[PDB]
């Protein structure tokens, strides 16, 4: 009896690498349903699967668009084993820009995919885990769900929302035998400028391209290998008493300690403004 | 001139009390635009205003539905002074129940009002504040945005979301001279059991009714009057250097410190489960 894993957002990045890590595991103890918003994007997954020699039957692909609870439901029905031992809620969108330049539809989509989409997944799959008295739920988290990042206001809103959702659930789930964990990632190796200028003031326009310069520098320095990140998910699964959070890096725990010394919140604001804008 | 204050969610509660507290101020320092989802519900606001003899012109009402960017824009345009000195984003919904028993449309509506609605407000009013280089924004927060609360998973998601949104913006806004503050409230005074069971499970059912009983007791002991809450808003807007957060109560400091001592979340999840479920 293999451990049945279902993962959202497997076309690229963390989801792709986790899927093939699990499916290729030497023990052959995982059966992986790697789900993608659009099945047409599955090529890279299968290329990576072959590169790691995933055994026949260890990896299957399903269409699962987390905006659509019928898509969620149909994917659940395709789990031939009739159970999910490990649910990985990884699908997510970023959104980068001055707040007032972001389209109202882009803002709503980020919330719908990142927050409501995770709700849809939990509504579909949590009940059977709770009834059975076992199951692991791993949710891809972000440093941006723990501290605010300029020009990522809506992304951060959505990642903070997941902290609140997951923590609230973890309090109830504590003695159910069902274990929810957030995997907190920093950076990971995986509008037009007219529009931005038209939709904001000149000072914000400047600060945005200052931010983009500083963000490329930090990304070059701090972007983790996706294999290293995937392995933290595996560690959380190995744990017999998994914690609510795991961190893929200690790089930001100083900021997190400092942030939480100051209940007023303004020391963080000052420090992060200085770190980003010099 | 007077300080121009625009407040959302003024039909009742915190919004109503703050609107009339500012408009009835003996010094007549404030011109208040009190906004309501539906203008037809303004009767109680005007009764409270007349009860405090709010002078003519100190208080004006507009319809403003935070779900509709056209409503937000139409309200902004009615501000005859052509500026807002203090914006109060107070409009909000609650949602209580086992996650899997909640309708997806109800979940979506909470995030749309509480989170996207606040984004719409900020998108419409920040640009003028940034351009003129001054402005204050006060946002109704919750201790449920700082720590997760069982059976309030979506409400907490939305309150955490406002933490991330506001913190991210505050980093950018420091050198613009536009100040953002969250007013962190504790509790505030304002399906069928077989349906709950059928949609969940035997353990969840027991915990839910345990939660409800315990919650009823905490509301009796700890819930604050909207007037007391309104007074904390007044302090924040009068602060020469306003901080990111103001707390209406110190009652939850212990659980809050429990949370921040242990970033893994273990100490908090255990402590909160013990607090709620005994
Ligand atoms: O990993 P990472 O941090 O490096 O970032 P990443 O590579 O951008 O990963 C995001 C993943 O989430 C998926 N996703 C986006 N919207 C989705 C939806 N509505 N339903 C299901 N999956 C969705 C993406 O697929 P798409 O890129 O095809 O949206 C992608 O596979
Ligand atoms: O006590 P408390 O102050 O904590 O809670 P409360 O009295 O329920 O206050 C919440 C306020 O938010 C408002 N609200 C809800 N949805 C809204 C929308 N789409 N647009 C604008 N305002 C909205 C409510 O108006 P309604 O009750 O009229 O929705 C109410 O005045
Ligand atoms: C804002 C930031 C640069 C950009 C990083 C970044 C970039 C992309 C991303 O998906 C996540 C993150 C999280 C950390 C962010 C940094 C923290 C300190 C700093 O200067
Ligand atoms: C969960 C809780 C009851 C419900 C409270 C509650 C309810 C509604 C709300 O808007 C805020 C809060 C904040 C504190 C919450 C309590 C902490 C300890 C406890 O037993």
Curated annotation (Swiss-Prot), chains A, B:
Residues that coordinate or bind NADP(+): 9-37, 65, 159
GO cellular component: cytoplasm; cytosol
Assigned EC number: 1.1.1.51, 1.1.1.62
Transmembrane segments: none
Main location, first listed in the record: cytoplasm
Pfam families assigned: adh_short
UniProt: substrate binding residues: 142
Residue numbers of Phosphoserine PTMs: 134
Family annotation (Gene3D superfamilies): NAD(P)-binding Rossmann-like Domain (3.40.50.720)
Pathway as given in its UniProt record: Steroid biosynthesis; estrogen biosynthesis
Role noted for this protein: Favors the reduction of estrogens and androgens. Converts estrone (E1) to a more potent estrogen, 17beta-estradiol (E2). Also has 20-alpha-HSD activity. Uses preferentially NADH.
Protein name: 17-beta-hydroxysteroid dehydrogenase type 1
Species, as recorded: Homo sapiens (Human)
Gene (UniProt): HSD17B1
